[PDB]
Copies of this chain bind each other. A is one copy, B any other.
Amino acid sequence: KPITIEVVSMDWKWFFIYPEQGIATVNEIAFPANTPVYFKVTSNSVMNSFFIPRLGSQIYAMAGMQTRLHLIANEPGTYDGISASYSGPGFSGMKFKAIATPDRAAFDQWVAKAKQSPNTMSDMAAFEKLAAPSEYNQVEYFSNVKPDLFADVINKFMA
């Protein structure tokens, strides 16, 4: 029933991981409406803001630390997500999309469309490649992800 999503604000794009489903995406998340969505958030750069106005959901993202946000979307639809309003270039294109699908079958189907992507997120080398400075990043799916990649990222900023 509850969906867990791991968020990592990279330089000028958002990266999302679906620990239970085995996928990861960039600038786009989906989940069934009227369902408990569980976000684990962290930054891999400067501190940021995981903000979805329409859903009254805001949570900071900071390197070295994992924040949490619990969300329920009651009406189906696609909500926009914005990031921190820093005046710097690159932050401006740092938006993402929240697809609160009409039901779970629709969610299941979105996973399936992801599991069909050729490109994966299997190791940290792949991680830093994606992590490299990029503006206005387009949506992207990854049919496979390294098991504890969220943890691995936090450990980069431990002491």
Contact = CB atoms under 8 A, between A and B. Distances in A.
A136 interface: no
A39 to B, nearest CB: 21
A85 B156 CA distance: 10
B133 A88 contact: no
B87 A156 contact: yes
Interface in A35-65: 43, 45-47, 63-64
A138 interface: no
Contacts of A156: 86-89
Nearest to A44: B46
Interface string A86-110: 1111000000000000000000000
Interface residues of A, number: 21
Interface of A: 43, 45-47, 63-64, 84-89, 128, 131-133, 155-159
Contacts of A131: 133
Given A46-B63, A87-B157, 12 more contacts: A46-B46, A47-B63, A84-B159, A86-B156, A86-B158, A87-B155, A87-B159, A88-B155, A88-B157, A128-B133, A132-B132, A133-B133
Contact of A85 (B89, B155, B159): B159
